[model samples]
Target: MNYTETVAYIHSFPRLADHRRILTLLHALGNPQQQGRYIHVTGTNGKGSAANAIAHVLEASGLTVGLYTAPFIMRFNERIMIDHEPIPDAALVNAVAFVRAALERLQQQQADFNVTEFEFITALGYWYFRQRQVDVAVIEVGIGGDTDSTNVITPVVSVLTEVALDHQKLLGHTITAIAKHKAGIIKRGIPVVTGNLVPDAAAVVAAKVATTGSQWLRFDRDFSVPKAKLHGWGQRFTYEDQDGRISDLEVPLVGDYQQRNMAIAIQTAKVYAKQTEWPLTPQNIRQGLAASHWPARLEKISDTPLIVIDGAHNPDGINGLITALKQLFSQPITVIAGILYAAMADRLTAAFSTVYLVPVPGTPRALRLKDSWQEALAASLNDVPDQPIVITGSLYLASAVRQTLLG
Candidate 1:
């Protein structure tokens, strides 16, 4: 099989229908869990950002770190980052080769291990992380946490970003239903950390934590975000709890909601402090918070057009994107959007920047537009002139625009 075709074709996930087969393959690869400690993140959103922040902070503390996330924009290597840097192309090629060879070996052994795109990709991440001897690996759940291959690990900290209703087809119909699935990461006795979620959804996860005897820390319960205020450039907040208090921390990532996200990361690390040997010093904590970066989330590009990109696909994420956009830009903001479908397109059109729906090339999911670049330029010059055009929603759309702009 052609390696390029294999990588591209394999990157697509096996449908939820194939969950059992997917999990089986992951177990056969010696499982990433056998090799290292994990920090598993789940929830409808912020999985990528949360993992990125935690991994960056860990690496800054001078330890080797591995980060694995999904839906790669530019390269497959982007999915598996080591020490805050995307593995070199040479390493990526090696990883793909190693996985392909491993797949052959599994088939030869007559093992019932037929890897899905995600499972194979996940294995590749684990193998690379192991080869590098990373101190810790931050794993982002590809889909809902329950059956997702990433859930196999006995994570040091199980972080659920927040519950929201999305992926109704595979997950569920409502927030509570979705939360139940996300709550799967709350393994017995493992500490779970999450943010301010709606009462209905929060109840589902809260009940699971209580029933399973897993330790839990909520935003304002064990740890309180007594103060969350936006400063000139970054946002800061105070995190205090029964253990002690950490105050006035600054985070570098874009977005207003991030103050709480950082608090969750800090509090989770703080809780793990009581469990693991990884001493998160005050300086290390501060350094981690200040150094965290997650691309395509309220990402600012050019200053003139006030160009920004956020991969806010679902309505819940859209709400945060809209709130942050309105707060960040007083001037009427021009929006460049390429949603996945007409249903979502309608919702996105209503809030955030004035809509300049563009082409989302290569995505059968993208709405009518050539691709993100076409939409961005049209919005910038023709549709929403004078106002800063912010490309919000869909990482594929953002990457298309970024590629075009780069050229």
Candidate 2:
């Protein structure tokens, strides 16, 4: 099949399922997961940023790096990237074709196993990285880590950005339950780097790390961000680990909380550097921080009216986004919020000056964007011309707004 048809066929399957089908599929395809070193990252938030930062640092160190993330901002191809370039259509089409054949065979052998959409995409990522012969790959877990399709890899280092309440239905409702799912990426003897976690979540992760005989490097204990403050459309902080202290490091992203994400990324890189025998100079770290680009997180789309889009789907993420939004703009803000689930609206609306609700298109779970909200958004845009326009609450909706604003 062609690229479009291939993607459609892949998406026709269920989005979530058990990992058995994927493992079988991989075995049929020769186990490409075994071909490369990996940095497996999992958490409720900051997965993309942490993964990107680590990839950027490794690339700056002259290593060939493959980055795999999910729920792309603009393009599906953005999910699988090498050297910061998305997989080409030609390559992706070929990879899908290859996996499709193996998938059919696997299903034929095991009648009960179902190859899922995420499974195919996960397999495609590993297959592409294997084909490229990358030195190391940075993988972002799509959902809960324990049974995630991407968990098949044996990572050199595991990074958990921040554990918070999210994906409650599939992953558990409590913070401790979610933390256990994320901490599943921590393997025996592998080291872990985490952001400052909540006490309940920390206990769960710490226990898991202990059980696995893995070294748990707490954020403040092992590595620390002594100082951080807001800068112009970015933030500056001091990152200190056992190696040494680096002062006045700047990351080109908004939010004071990003300091933790950046710290996790830097510490993960340091650990990976030691394990791989690579040179990670201070200059490389600084350059990587400055060069790292994670889109759809307070991403400024326009200067006039200052349009920004972020994917804050859950309460914890929205809380962080709200805090960042308050610090970033002094002017009144007009928020164009969309949500896949109805429960998110209260959290988003409570924070913004004015919120216009919209449905995340093509999802069954979304709270429908009514006509009144659409009209309200238009009126609000005209009424508050100087105020910044922030579109958030869901990545699917953020993608729609991004296309309209950018294209």
Estimated TM-score for each candidate: 0.85, 0.90
Task: Give one digit per residue, the lDDT tens place, for model 1 in 44-150.
Answer: 76777777777766776677888898866555668888877788866677667766776777677775556666777777787788888888888889888887877
Poorest lDDT segment (10 consecutive residues) of candidate 2: 365-374
Candidate 1: C-alpha lDDT: 0.72
Alpha-carbon runs more than 4 Å astray in model 2: 15-18, 107-113, 341-354, 363-385
Q: Candidate 1 vs. truth: CA RMSD?
A: 3.5
Cα lDDT of model 2 by residue, 1-63, tens digit: 888997788788775545667888888888999887999998877888889999998899899
Steric clash pairs (candidate 2): none
Clashing pairs in 1: 359-369, 359-370, 359-371
For all the candidates, what are their Cα RMSDs to the real structure? 3.5, 2.8
What TM value does model 1 have? 0.85
